[PDB]
């Protein structure tokens, strides 16, 4: 709070002491630079909780999305939430993708790139066929299915980021 | 704050009252045992937020990693972050793994073991073949592909822990 000096020989001493006590006490309920057990508040600084934390409402972390055609008609849709990337494989194979080939139409942007190679497992509609697409730290994705020229690739999951 | 008694008949009364008000008021900005809207602070005790929480920076939870060859050349790399385990299947099949067999070179350590059996889906480089490896509560992983003696198994995802 913003208080007034209580000093030897001041006028209205009792009034000043009371005013200061009231302003200080007000900040034990709300406002000022203190975090309270009620009210919508914005809190700066690094806060380390050494104990257990429970959140009964929603917990919202920073979020960003990106989607692009990696190559050969394969679409990768991403959403970063904290240190996790939610992915969804989409699109439809529109040209021949060679076994073990790099997908060169779009690279995954640096901010969605993992520390180490992540293998995203997918499945082709209408049969029993699976594949995986690697996302390396470079974001230059690689197709690890066999040579394929058609089909509908799908798969939802996550991979970690730093 | 650490304050001085204000009492009937004390000397320097105004000075003592002012000193106490100032020390108390200082703790409405920083220090003491109060959590503030600024500053890097360490907070003990169980904290339950009944409302909505937003974190604009990073949210860091306890983390631990483990990696090992489960068996037959298959490597499982894990990272526990809170109640989630991030996994990555690696290695290369170096000996025959029978259909439905236990992987007995390494068990997943107890602290990375789920409550119930988790089926981790993977894919073999260069073809359309998928498999899954079960992680039971015992950590004695099981191969659910057919009998296989070669190949490069991959797959990134997560499974839950208590």
């Amino acid at each position: 709070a913003s208080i007034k000096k209580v000093y030897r020989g001041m006028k209205n001493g009792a009034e000043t002491i009371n005013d200061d006590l009231e302003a200080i006490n007000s900040e034990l309920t709300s406002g000022g630079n203190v975090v309270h057990k009620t009210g919508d508040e914005t809190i700066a600084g690094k806060k380390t909780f050494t104990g257990n934390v429970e959140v009964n409402g929603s917990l919202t972390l920073p979020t960003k999305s990106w989607s692009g055609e990696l190559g050969g008609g394969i679409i990768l849709s991403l959403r970063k939430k904290g240190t996790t990337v939610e992915y969804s494989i989409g699109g439809e194979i529109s040209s021949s993708i060679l076994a073990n080939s790099n997908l060169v139409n779009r690279s995954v942007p640096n901010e969605f790139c993992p520390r180490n190679r992540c293998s995203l497992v997918g499945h082709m509609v209408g049969g029993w066929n699976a594949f995986h697409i690697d996302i390396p730290s470079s974001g230059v994705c690689q197709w690890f299915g066999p040579t394929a020229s058609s089909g509908t690739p799908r798969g939802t999951g996550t991979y970690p980021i730093d | 704050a650490s304050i001085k008694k204000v009492y009937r008949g004390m000397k320097n009364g105004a000075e003592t009252i002012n000193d106490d008000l100032e020390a108390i008021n200082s703790e409405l900005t920083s220090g003491g045992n109060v959590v503030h809207k600024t500053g890097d602070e360490t907070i003990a005790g169980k904290k339950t937020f009944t409302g909505n929480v937003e974190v604009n920076g990073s949210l860091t939870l306890p983390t631990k990693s483990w990696s090992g060859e489960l068996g037959g050349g298959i490597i499982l790399s894990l990272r526990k972050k809170g109640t989630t385990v991030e996994y990555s299947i690696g290695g290369e099949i170096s000996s025959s793994i029978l259909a439905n067999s236990n992987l007995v070179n390494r068990s997943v350590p107890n602290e990375f073991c789920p409550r119930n059996r988790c089926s981790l889906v993977g894919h073999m480089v260069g073809g359309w073949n998928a498999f899954h490896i079960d992680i039971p509560s015992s950590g004695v992983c099981q191969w659910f592909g057919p009998t296989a003696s070669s190949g490069t198994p991959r797959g990134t995802g997560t499974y839950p822990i208590d």
Partner: nanobody
Amino acid sequence: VQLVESGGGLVQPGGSLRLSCEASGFSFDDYAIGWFRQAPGKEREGVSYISMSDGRTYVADSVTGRFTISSDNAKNTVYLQMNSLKLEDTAVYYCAAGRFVTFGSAWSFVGGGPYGIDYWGKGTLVTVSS
């Protein structure tokens, strides 16, 4: 929605300086506009504020008799006249706008954010050295 400061500089002890804050983009009916200051080596401390409605003021004990606050609602500008400057007045001074409550001569900023303040200026450096 901007608070623009000016007037900071280097002065010798006993020197004078006049800070200005151009406040625009908000009501005023509910606000007090004023000044804090902060070392790189400190948290903020409130210096002096003025009610944008009734003109009631606050002046911190560390600066009473030396610093005086003024306003002019038209130019959307608040002033801090800093006289008899001391080495310990060295800091970056931030213009601030906040909703508040008073208890006689004592004040409290009521905002949900840091220091109970809604808006901050970029800051103006005041340096007092021999």
